[PDB]
Design a protein around this nucleic acid. Structure first.
Lengths: 310, 954, 317, 315, 54
DNA sequence: GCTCTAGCAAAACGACTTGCACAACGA
DNA sequence: GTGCAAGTCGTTTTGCTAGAGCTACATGTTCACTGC
């Protein structure tokens, strides 16, 4: 249930959170034996209330006493609906509320306005993304066994070439387009491996074939996971690195990018070819995300870029 | 005017509602209308709707006062069909969807649980001493130990923690179950030097959490009690504690060395004990912000006293359990106790510790549910519906006033004064008020207490008949509390085994009548072994002396506080003739009222007269108690303002108040109204006032005028009774003399009260008539002066449904300088310049109900104000508020220096026949005893031991 | 859908809910709150579309599905103390309200960029604070001296004394060299406003209580009204995407300070008159809240709040 | 008391066709045929001022009694503006049923009869009527922004010239025959200026319901709305409808017509033409006219005018 | 802009109508709602009701 | 645990049937 | 003949009880044109 070992983030489902006798208690079908009792309550913990759960104001009081962030997310924890805002660590605020302020916003803003540094960040994002493609498509054979048998030499050549291109070109405007070309080739490779036939990527949900729908669902979950990552870091969604400065919710899409083609896309084609239900697809996606430590990776990346930007 | 009308009517009503509205507005929905209309027109519409409204009628009228705003004008009929803004619910179900049962407001239950469990794991460790073990195994001569086991335990605890340590350090070390080294034993500060080590509660020695546990362990048989009792030390009281406070004795150094000898080792070897303590410490450490709260926790009366309560109640119960093996390691060498019957080792030491800890935890979990599971009185017809005779109509005024502030009291607390005059059936009013304050929706629980030196069966039965209550509803507690003598007798008997907690909760000289269910008791697991206490708690309503509740605050030794304290913590309190106490007794009463407010009970004072200084002192006590209480129940942070109330023949009133100043100004206002209103009512009685110069009591001891007009102590009463019997009646006069004093046996007192209650053209048809200071709780009377309270209340006995006063009290005739010392609050510090006695016309409570050497009433006012309001009164400085303004309650100090029922003491009357040396309403002891033994189902001698008691002087 | 629901402009939704002793759940696709009524449990409707925020008090609980719906509609949820007290407070710590902001409804990206552009230089912040106060003063004058509703309700105030107080404070604001002096001026301004309000309302002598501990009706109403202001401020700052943390004035004794800084815009211009007015009428907390929300709706408090935030960000370029 | 609402403040006025007006469960209602079913509709009598009954409708005695108690005028009329009856030289636009169980005040009646039986005083009253008529039309067509917003563009200069000329014409008009000839001329003036003021081109005023164009139809229908409000005003004062001052010498119950003109030109004419421009249906035209009449508190003005003329004619 | 809504629906339709309107206004009667609302909101309301009318 | 769906039963609701009264109380 | 009232009786609406699943569907940017 520990959703991110890097963030001390826990997912609670099928239980009520209430305060009896001055201690926050979980009313669950397992009673005393539920693992929720092992939840450490400290300023380092952060909760994610899941499906079928409710919380009492008294609990909110006790958690605030202990300084524990709370957030509501849907099935499996991908769509993050609402959460507590996290503080910002600077010398002029200084409340004693015992809430672990986080300093990453200052680091982010310290460079966000300098375009050259912003570009350097974009490059760093894409380096990470490609290396996660090469990892999941080649190094690990779980997909191979599942049925996603694809050629390697063509994929390796394409990825090598795109990586070679990343280290070049002057502005965001090229990077976006280079990624788009890589995207197209990856789609073609996946369709060939899946024997799905010809594939064309419609957008704004105009597609009707299973592949398109499953891609949309997968991307929706990925966005939710990224939103969780940013919220844990406290960075507002508007300070995008690679998407346009006017794009509402740009940053989450920047962060979501580092898994779409690594983990969502193959599963979308696999499930479409296998003829799965939408529910089966959702469960498979969440299982893949859990297996890959996705949230932890996207946390590590954001921290790495912050430290590297100095 | 632009109206929208909506209907929520039912069945027949909605046909009528349609008939009305349809004439004033077009129908725009199945139950709605909307039109413009004149203001006068709307008023007429409202009147017509109200003219004929079923209970089913429900109509709401909305006004659109302009662009983008609307308002609610009025509702006709059942307002429950709408919320405040005039909305209507979408769905409703009788299913319990809210489930408010699941969680509770005991916002400190966990803290007390942790502290208690920690103490239990150490509470009886000191019994591991070689001296104690030798005492345990010795069946011969019993020896009193150098120190009680608990003090040894506390020193062990302090040694384990080590001086100067932070709470975290010792908690961490205890939690680390790897550690077993006993090298710290060398650090132990043996008390058996020539030099005495510093008190473990000193600033340098123990940190807050450790101090809390230390106090909780050392105070598990008797409160600490030293000699230093000044304010400067009382404010830091836990620190001054020392060995001498805790029953240290004189003995040879060898025995003290045996006390500090542990040849068999500490319980640290046992697997469970180490694991359980480590787990408890870990849980305590993981609790959020507990360490920072520690220092405030040490001074909190609520936390400490609840934990003490739970601690003994566990230790007492388990000590009575038979032994078992599954707990701990059966091969443990040390033991905890010796079986009383077989005189053999019973329980292993670790077995005892773990058992007490387990049971304490169970209690901690159980306690919040007690108020949910205990019996209650609900929907009693007598309380609810109105009274028919105007003589008592004011009682309905009071009931309505209480009903008007129910939920406010439920939140903030309540402090009401029933100030009404005698003879107005105050008992019913008090009962109705308390029943009103209960939640109508599960029922009431309250107690009626009075200041009688001891209570008889009759007064309880009278209450039962006045209230219309069954034997399963109202319980009665007879007699009074026992004295220290028997307790020390018993501890001499029992300390040989060390199970001092085995002393019964209620002294067996006490007894309780109640005819309800016992097995339903939520506390049966721990009180079924003493049916008396279980009955005391089970009864929805109980009547008793005030004496029976004091052990809550006055039980310096033994577990006698358990029962009454639980009673306070689960029921409300009524005090009646509370003012009848003597001055030295009020401080204890204030302590009781303070605790009553500390544990969430609600208080109702009842009397015909009540000095303002008295109520101010008590109120400030209750206010302080409630303020402490609200830190641990209900919604945190809410401000303290108690719901005060007043009741009277003329009026009833209530108001919230935050501090004494406003309260007194309100109380004085109510007094001003009462006395002014009383002066309108015609006088009912007329007072009047000796050729006695001799000094020999018999000769000087040795009606007709009254008849032609219209038709302080036991020993002098007996003397004059003998004199009258010798003299006889004068010419043309037949005298019937009914004697009823306080030293008659309870059996006889009950019979006499029964006869007097029954007997006092239609009058002459009664059988007996045709055939022919304890009174303060007729056509004419003769009174010896004692005080204004006695003067008026005795005067209240006259023509209730003409009085002559002796100019001086017999002790004044004897020339005693503070003549009124016994009856009144005269003292050598506070004397009168003389004892020779407008108020003569109207005998009203006025003079002492208000506060304004030559006026006894003035002296009494001064004594009250000095004793319980002033900070620096004359004479010794031990004012009342020290009880809650300091950590005093951690010791028996104030119970010692301001004792209850103080002074010369009785002995309950081993055959001692050698010491013995040989009318209307008279009673034969044998006849009544024989009858009542059958009514009671007892042997005659056993019945005598139950009701033949008298509180004679030794 | 997430769209077709956030169509009512947030600055024009006409509700703001305060709830106690109830459970906020979902029933038949609708978000409802249920209250125990003895006879039955009664379900009550909540129009999430026409709602700015929920404030949940004592003995109140909420379920996840309701959060999903409220987040979709862009409604704030706040857990608070009982009817005018902090949710949390111990020693010298206070946590007035714990806010659950929606995270799945992406918000504009410009005001945030301006705000964070200037928020990291104390002088620029100080200029922002000055603008906040000048707006507050302006609102005070307009509302007290130019509103017919408050006057007709019986809020007759001494124009001359108020004018000189405003001018004196405004000059001091200009003199303010740093934050501490600014806060002292805030304090002096505040109580002089209390003094004027009270004796203009026949209330007589008055004093402001500390940390929600007041006994008299005026203090209790003021403490309660503050939460309504907090709610409107929280939604005002959210709808522009500005995180609560980035305060300018009250930040260094409060979590999510910017809410309080914004709330001051409306704390005194409204609320303060209404509180004393209701106290005069002997009203009941339920009534005071109803009337207060009516005034806040009529004066378009949220719109003024939103405009001011836009302007001060705007003005910092 | 159903008659607490002052008549001039009452809300509604009803026109009904193809229905039966009856009592049902204490309510007064009218029933319409809706295909297989029949539907009952509610008449809020206490808040109405009068009823117009048209083609193919009938009433029952109980309903009449309830209406009388609430003091609601009742009227039978032809369908869609046609007279209830007409021979070649005879017209009966409406047959009125006035409550008689309730007792009107007296002072106004006594004043009216006091002055009604001599020519000169009637002449004076007629002059007062016409002067009020001019006052209202001027105020409505000039100082009301609602009509301007609705699209009633009118030439102020021509209006001023015509109104001033008419006002001059009333003074030293010798005999009522001249006076009514004059106001007929005034009507012609108003028809033309309004038509050219609403882009209706050339318009010719038809006569007693013979018109075919929408404008004539709507204005003929509006005549009855005016009749209804005038009749209730007259009854409220307690004057019998027969004591006319101008139109009595062709009409029956003339005074209702004479009072009606107070309304007709000022309020009906614009809405009629405006609706014709919008090509709106008849129901919408009536709804708008109704709504305007309430907006202007017109019934109140008719009452005030009668009171004032009574006073001024007293001396 | 200030609105008053009434529903004469029945059977399955009534439940759907309640599902929509309850999200835009407090309920004042068994079948009626009343609230202020902006013009754009009202347009959205009508569009939603039409989308699933019966 | 929370909410939705399907099936049931009770109650509320409105229309129909019949028998009959035939009303409305200051001057 | 019109309307009331008492009794019947077919829908229609609400809540209760089991039982079963566990959603919420694009997101490349900048800027010129369009409403109040």
């Amino acid at each position: 249930i520990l959703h991110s070992k890097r963030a001390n983030l826990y997912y609670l489902q099928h239980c009520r959170v209430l305060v009896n006798g001055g201690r926050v208690e979980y009313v669950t079908d397992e009673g005393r034996h539920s693992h929720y009792w092992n939840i450490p309550i400290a300023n380092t913990t952060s909760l994610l209330l899941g499906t079928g759960t409710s919380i009492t104001q008294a609990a909110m009081r006790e958690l605030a006493r202990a300084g524990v962030l709370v957030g509501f997310c849907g099935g499996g924890g991908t769509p993050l609906f609402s959460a507590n805002e996290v503080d910002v660590e600077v010398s002029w605020l200084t409340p004693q509320s015992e809430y672990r302020p986080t300093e990453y916003l200052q680091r982010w803003v310290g460079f966000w306005f300098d375009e050259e540094k912003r570009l350097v960040a974009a490059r760093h994002f894409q380096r990470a993304r490609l290396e996660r493609i090469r990892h999941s498509w080649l190094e690990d054979r779980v997909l191979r066994d599942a049925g996603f048998a694809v050629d390697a030499t063509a994929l390796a050549v394409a990825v090598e070439d795109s990586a070679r291109a990343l280290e070049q070109a002057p502005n965001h405007e090229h990077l976006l387009t280079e990624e788009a070309r890589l995207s197209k080739r990856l789609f073609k490779l996946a369709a060939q491996a899946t024997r799905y036939g010809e594939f064309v990527r419609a957008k704004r949900g105009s597609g009707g074939d299973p592949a398109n729908r499953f891609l949309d669902h997968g991307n929706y979950l990925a966005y939710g996971l990224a939103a969780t990552a940013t919220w844990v870091l406290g960075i507002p969604h508007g300070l995008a690195v690679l998407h346009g400065k006017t794009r509402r919710g740009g940053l989450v899409f920047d962060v979501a990018d580092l898994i779409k083609d690594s983990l969502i896309l193959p599963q979308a084609f696999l499930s479409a070819m296998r003829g799965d239900e939408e529910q089966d697809f959702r469960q498979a996606c969440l299982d893949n995300l859990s297996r890959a430590q996705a949230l932890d990776f996207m946390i590590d990346t954001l921290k790495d870029v912050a430290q590297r930007s100095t | 005017m632009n109206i929208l009308l909506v209907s929520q009517c039912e069945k027949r009503a909605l046909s009528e509602t349609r008939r009305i509205l349809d004439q004033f507005a077009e129908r725009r929905g199945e139950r709605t209308w909307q039109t413009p209309i004149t203001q006068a027109g709307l008023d007429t519409l409202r009147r017509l709707l109200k003219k004929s409204a079923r209970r089913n009628t429900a109509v709401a009228c909305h006004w659109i006062r302009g662009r983008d705003h609307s308002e609610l004008l009025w509702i006709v009929g059942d307002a429950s069909r709408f919320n405040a803004q005039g909305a209507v619910p979408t769905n409703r179900t009788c299913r319990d969807i809210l489930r408010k049962e699941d969680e509770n407001d005991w916002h400190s239950a966990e803290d007390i649980r942790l502290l208690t469990v920690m103490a239990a794991l150490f509470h009886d460790i000191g019994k591991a001493s070689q001296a104690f073990q030798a005492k345990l195994r010795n069946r011969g001569k019993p020896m009193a130990d150098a120190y009680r086991h608990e003090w040894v335990s506390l020193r062990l605890f302090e040694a384990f923690v080590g001086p100067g340590s932070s709470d975290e350090d010792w908690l961490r070390r205890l939690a680390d179950k790897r550690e077993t080294g006993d090298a710290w034993l060398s650090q132990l500060a043996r008390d058996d030097r020539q030099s005495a080590p510093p008190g473990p509660f000193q600033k340098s020695r123990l940190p807050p959490l450790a101090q809390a546990v230390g106090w909780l362990i050392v105070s598990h048989h008797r409160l600490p009690n030293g000699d230093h009792r000044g304010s400067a030390s009382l404010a830091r009281l836990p620190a001054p504690i020392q060995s001498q406070w805790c029953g240290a004795r004189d003995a040879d150094a060898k025995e003290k060395a045996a006390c500090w000898q542990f040849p068999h080792g500490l319980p640290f070897a046992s697997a469970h004990w180490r694991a359980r303590t480590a787990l408890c410490a870990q849980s305590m450490l993981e609790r959020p912000g507990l360490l920072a709260r520690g220092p405030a926790l040490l001074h909190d009366s609520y936390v400490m006293h609840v934990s003490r309560l739970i601690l003994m109640l566990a230790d007492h119960h388990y000590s009575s359990l038979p032994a078992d093996s599954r707990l701990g390691d059966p091969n443990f060498p040390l033991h905890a106790n010796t079986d009383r019957d077989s005189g053999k080792l019973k329980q292993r030491l670790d077995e005892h510790l773990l058992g007490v800890a387990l049971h304490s935890r169970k209690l901690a979990g159980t306690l919040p549910r007690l108020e949910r599971q205990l019996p209650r009185l609900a929907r009693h017809k007598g309380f609810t519906r109105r009274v028919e005779q105007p003589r008592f109509r004011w009682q309905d005024k009071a009931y309505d006033c209480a009903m008007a502030c129910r939920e406010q009291a439920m939140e903030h607390g309540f402090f009401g004064l029933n100030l009404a005059s005698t003879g107005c059936g105050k008992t019913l009013a008090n009962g109705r008020i308390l029943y009103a304050l209960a939640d109508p929706q599960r029922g009431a629980r309250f107690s009626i207490a009075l200041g009688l030196r001891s209570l008889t069966l009759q007064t309880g039965q009278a209450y039962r008949e006045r209230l219309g209550l069954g034997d399963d509803d109202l319980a009665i507690l007879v007699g009074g509390s026992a004295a220290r003598e028997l307790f020390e007798k018993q501890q001499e008997r029992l300390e040989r085994s060390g199970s001092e907690s085995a002393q019964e909760l209620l002294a067996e000289n006490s007894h309780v009548h109640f005819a309800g269910t016992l097995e339903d008791g939520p506390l049966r697991e721990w009180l079924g072994r003493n049916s008396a206490g279980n009955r005391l708690l089970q009864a929805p309503i109980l009547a008793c002396t005030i004496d029976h509740l004091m052990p809550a605050s006055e039980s310096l030794r033994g577990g006698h506080q358990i029962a009454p304290l639980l009673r306070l913590m689960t029921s409300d309190l009524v005090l009646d003739e509370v003012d009848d106490f003597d001055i030295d007794d009020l401080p204890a009463l204030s302590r009781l009222v303070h605790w009553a407010g500390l544990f969430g009970s609600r208080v109702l004072l009842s009397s015909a007269t009540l000095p303002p200084a008295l109520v101010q002192g008590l109120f400030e006590a209750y206010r302080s108690g409630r303020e402490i209480f609200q830190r641990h129940r209900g919604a945190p942070g809410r401000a303290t303002e108690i719901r005060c109330a007043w009741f009277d023949e003329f009026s009833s009133q209530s108001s919230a108040h935050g501090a004494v100043t406003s309260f007194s100004e309100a109380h004085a206002t109510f007094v001003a109204q009462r006395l002014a209103k009383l002066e309108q009512l015609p006088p009912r009685r007329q007072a009047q006032l000796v050729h006695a110069a001799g000094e020999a009591r018999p000769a000087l001891c040795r009606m007709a005028d009254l008849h032609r007009c219209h038709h302080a102590n036991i020993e002098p009463l007996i003397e004059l009774a003998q004199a009258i019997l010798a003299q006889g009646a004068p010419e043309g006069l037949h005298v019937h003399l009914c004697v009823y004093h306080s030293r008659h046996p309870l059996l006889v007192r009950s019979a006499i009260e029964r006869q007097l209650d029954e007997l006092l053209a239609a009058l002459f048809a009664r059988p007996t008539l045709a055939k022919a200071p304890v009174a303060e709780v007729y056509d004419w009377a003769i009174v010896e002066p004692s005080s204004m309270r006695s003067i008026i209340q005795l005067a209240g006995r006259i023509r209730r449904h003409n009085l002559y006063l002796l100019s001086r009290n017999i002790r004044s005739l004897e020339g005693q300088n503070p003549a009124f010392q016994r009856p009144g609050f005269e003292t050598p510090d506070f004397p009168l310049d003389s004892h020779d006695l407008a108020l003569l016309a109207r005998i009203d409570a006025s003079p002492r109900i208000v506060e304004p050497r030559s006026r006894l009433v003035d002296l009494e006012h001064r004594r009250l104000r000095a004793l319980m309001l002033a900070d620096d009164p004359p004479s010794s400085l031990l004012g009342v508020p020290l009880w809650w303004q300091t950590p005093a309650s951690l010791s028996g100090a104030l119970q010692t220096s301001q004792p209850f029922r103080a002074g010369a003491k009785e002995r309950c009357y081993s055959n001692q026949d050698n010491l013995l040396r040989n009318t209307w309403g008279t009673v034969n002891y044998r006849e009544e005893l024989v009858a009542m033994a059958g009514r009671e189902d007892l042997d005659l001698r056993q019945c005598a031991m139950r009701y033949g008691e008298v509180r004679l002087r030794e």
